């Protein structure tokens, strides 16, 4: 089956307060498994999932040292970034990196990532061919130019196709009990009085993993014309996720509405009437 290994890295400069905030989190699919927090009393990569606690000190020391090295790079990059743009000194700014690998069911690199954002906007990204770069603007062009000449594409392709995919395999083994599961959603509709003519119908999907889900309403079978509310999928706190979708329907007309739920853990899609 399809799986992914992702790191989400964040650095925030804080002038007058000390060195920048630096945090990296690691995910396999929708399950977090490692972290680095520069404000922690002792800065080190540490496990954030039960199945990672068995790893040897060599694992943790190499992870910690690769992160501390990345942190340093971010300090320079924040400074370099502020100069490239000609921004005012003294302000707080953000740098983000996302990298990792998606593999398909034939254990094959569907997509490798090495991309950056400055102040919440795209900066530079390694294209899908793992050979070329996309610069978001004339500042990033300077960086693209340097990374082209230095051969950074090949350096990270080697990582993306090797270490990344090789250790994704290992993580899936370590946590097979939890990672390879499909918790189906428990679904139900709730009824909430609004006005003297309308009423709210809310369709709930709870307790499911992975986080991808499809939740909608339809009237008699065709798509909606009204204005459905569909909230962001959200973590329950225990490794499962929640979502709901709501519609405002005419009193007396509630039976023409159905809620549909599609999920990887549902051998049949759900159809709920109130």
């Amino acid at each position: 089956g399809p799986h992914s290994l992702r790191y989400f890295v964040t650095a925030v400069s804080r002038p007058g307060l000390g060195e920048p905030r630096f945090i990296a989190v690691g995910y396999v699919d929708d399950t977090q498994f490692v972290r680095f927090d520069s404000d922690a009393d002792n800065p080190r990569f540490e496990p954030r999932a039960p199945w990672m606690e068995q790893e040897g000190p060599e694992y943790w020391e190499e992870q910690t040292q690769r992160a501390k090295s990345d942190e340093q790079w971010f300090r320079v990059s924040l400074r370099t970034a502020q100069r490239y743009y000609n921004q005012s000194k003294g302000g707080s700014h953000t740098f983000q990196r996302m990298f990792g690998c998606d593999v398909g069911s034939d254990w094959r690199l569907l997509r490798g990532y090495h991309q950056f954002a400055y102040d919440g906007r795209d900066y530079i990204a390694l294209n899908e061919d793992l050979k070329t770069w996309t610069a978001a603007d004339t500042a990033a062009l300077i960086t693209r130019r340097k990374w082209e000449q230095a051969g950074d594409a090949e350096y990270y392709r080697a990582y993306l196709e090797g270490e990344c995919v090789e250790w994704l395999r290992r993580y899936l083994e370590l946590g097979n009990e939890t990672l390879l599961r499909t918790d189906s959603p428990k679904a139900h509709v709730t009824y909430h009085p609004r006005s003297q003519v309308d009423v709210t119908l809310r369709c709930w999907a709870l307790g499911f993993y992975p986080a991808d889900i499809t939740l909608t309403w339809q009237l008699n079978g065709e798509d909606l014309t009204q204005d459905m509310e569909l909230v962001e999928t959200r973590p329950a706190g225990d490794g499962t996720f929640q979502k709901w979708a709501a519609v405002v329907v005419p009193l007396g007309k509630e039976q023409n509405y159905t809620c549909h739920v599609h999920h990887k853990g549902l051998p049949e899609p759900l159809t709920l009437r109130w």
């Binding site: 992870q63 990374w147 990582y159």
Partner: peptide, 10 residues
Amino acid sequence: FYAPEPITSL
């Protein structure tokens, strides 16, 4: 497994 140490600068 974290990415290997950066080689080029921004």
